[PDB]
Curated annotation (Swiss-Prot):
Changing residue 110 to E: 10-fold decrease in catalytic efficiency with ABTS as substrate. 91-fold decrease in catalytic efficiency with 2,6-DMP as substrate. Induction: Expression is switched on about four to five hours after the onset of sporulation, a time that corresponds approximately to the stage of spore coat synthesis and deposition. Glu-492, located within the entrance channel of the trinuclear center, plays a key role in the protonation events that occur at the trinuclear center and in its stabilization, controlling therefore the binding of dioxygen and its further reduction. Asp-110, situated in the exit channel of the trinuclear center, and its hydrogen bond connectivity are highly relevant for the overall reactivity of the laccase but do not appear to play a critical structural role. The gene is cotA. The lineage of its organism: Bacteria, Bacillati, Bacillota, Bacilli, Bacillales. This is Laccase.
Length: 505
């Protein structure tokens, strides 16, 4: 296997605006097929990248900054990864649309899966309205990220390399003196399988495919043989002996990570998907499913000279392998201090979400289910509805709902709602067999409130097997057509995604 920790961690450059005034910031980002070396010992890999980079440029904005991004497709007319033509029913082969994950965004700038476009916008999907997306950024400071969201192609376009970081800085948070600038570093984690010739491998069918299966065929899960951070295989990062802030993003298709430091050191979590936690949390490990973000401080002050592995204990399709996927990256505490560490790790960070006292307008019960298709493949469904079925999740703008998510399946699903961030209320285990036979919900234990890591704002949430997860969301400030879905991309594409209409009655 590839030798670990021989390439330095890339830190994507921050994107520069094409035009900027006090009133408007304007960016242009063009999707390009390019080649990049992913490891010292590999030939360059053909990838799809925003501005031809993998990951894409980091975009940094201020809270309330009036931002526009013209996302453009300049990709080849043929994909290089295997397309399954049976999962969606003349359209172009390569369709793209950019979604700002976590963005409080008007609906026509949200990257609806059917708002896709081909090269130069030559062909556009039925929900396409505009070329230049508008991000008003009227939301809490947080780690966001942007990625492709095209109908029935999301798992492929994201795997190809179409992911990047987007950070909203709220100037009100500056007084906290959290590690900043060079000491504030995004970590986009993506698992990949790479052929000897350097080319990406993505499966064209399940292992030992039934003769009944189409070719190519979608698979329900992808587990990569190798882990990359910021577009390099098992990299090292030279750090100063001081406090760093890391914006940890799971940009993988399926894989969940459970992260720790191999010297037994602690993380201090300061933020979740939706921004700063009300109080900092000391953690020895944390779970990170697709699309979740952790905003953490690691304090290297006492560890000068040491090499510390960011390790992983979560399996993907089996037990973790000590020599491969148990490793994410390596910190080397060998960079001389550039200046005094004047950063802080404060306990008191932000207002509790619980200060809010919104009236519960609706309690929405939702189930994670699915069926089997004519080929014998599993089709994962929210409420046993297809993406194309008439909309059923129709919250009213400005109102608050409790969503009760029932998971009788064998696995976790990282459920994501567009537009909003939400509070986690509790998780409660239930009798799966009884639910499957009668549809009746019989609890097998008391409700468990969220751990401190989940006492802030979330937008992607692990709904574990055999549990009912309750979340509370206020639907706004915008009305329009959004979505909600499982963020395991293999599930999302077939067919665990539903429209979500926020109505203005
Ligand atoms: Cu996303
Ligand atoms: Cu999203
Ligand atoms: Cu799923
Ligand atoms: Cu989405």
């Amino acid at each position: 296997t590839l030798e670990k920790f021989v390439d330095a961690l890339p830190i994507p450059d921050t994107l520069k605006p094409v035009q900027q005034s006090k009133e408007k910031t304007y960016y242009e980002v063009t999707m390009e097929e390019c080649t990049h070396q992913l490891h010292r010992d590999l030939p360059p890999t053909r990838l799809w990248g925003y501005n031809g980079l993998f990951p894409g440029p980091t975009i940094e904005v201020k809270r309330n900054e009036n931002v526009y991004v013209k996302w453009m497709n300049n990709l080849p007319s043929t994909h290089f990864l295997p397309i399954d033509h049976t999962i969606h029913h003349e359209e172009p082969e390569v369709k793209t649309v950019v979604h700002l994950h976590g963005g409080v965004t008007p609906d026509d700038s949200d990257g609806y899966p059917e708002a896709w476009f081909s090269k130069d916008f030559e062909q556009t999907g039925p929900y396409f309205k505009r070329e230049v997306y508008h991000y008003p950024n009227q939301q809490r400071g947080a780690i966001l990220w942007y990625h492709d969201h095209a109908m029935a192609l999301t798992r492929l376009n994201v795997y190809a390399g179409l992911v990047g970081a987007y950070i909203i800085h709220d100037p009100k948070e500056k007084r906290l003196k959290l590690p900043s600038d060079e000491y504030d570093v995004p970590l986009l984690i993506t698992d990949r399988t790479i052929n000897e010739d350097g080319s990406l491998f993505y499966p064209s069918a399940p292992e030992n495919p039934s003769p009944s299966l189409p070719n190519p065929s979608i698979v329900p899960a992808f587990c990569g043989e190798t882990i990359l951070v910021n577009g390099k295989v098992w990299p090292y990062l030279e750090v100063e002996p001081r406090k760093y802030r890391f914006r940890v993003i799971n940009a993988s298709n399926t894989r969940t990570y459970n992260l720790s430091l191999d010297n037994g050191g602690d993380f201090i979590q300061i933020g979740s998907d939706g921004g700063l936690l009300p109080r900092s949390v000391k953690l020895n490990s944390f779970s990170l499913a697709p699309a979740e973000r952790y905003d953490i401080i690691i304090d290297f002050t006492a560890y000068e000279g040491e090499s510390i592995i960011l390790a992983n204990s979560a399996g993907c399709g089996g037990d973790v392998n000590p020599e491969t996927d148990a490793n994410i990256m390596q910190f080397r505490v060998t960079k001389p201090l550039a200046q005094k560490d004047e950063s802080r790790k404060p306990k008191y960070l932000a207002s509790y979400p619980s200060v809010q006292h919104e009236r519960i307008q609706n309690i929405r019960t939702l189930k994670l289910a699915g069926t089997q298709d004519e080929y014998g493949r599993p089709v994962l469904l929210l409420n046993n509805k297809r993406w194309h079925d008439p909309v059923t999740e129709t919250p009213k703008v400005g109102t608050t709902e409790i969503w009760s998510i029932i998971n009788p399946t064998r696995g976790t699903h990282p459920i994501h709602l567009h537009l909003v961030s939400f509070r986690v209320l509790d998780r409660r285990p239930f009798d799966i067999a009884r639910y499957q036979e009668s549809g009746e919900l019989s609890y097998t234990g008391p409700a468990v409130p969220p751990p401190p890591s989940e006492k802030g704002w979330k937008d992607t949430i692990q709904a574990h097997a055999g549990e009912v997860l309750r979340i509370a969301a206020t639907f706004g400030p915008y009305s329009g057509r959004y979505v909600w879905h499982c963020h395991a991309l293999e599930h999302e594409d077939y067919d665990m995604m539903r429209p979500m209409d926020i109505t203005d009655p």
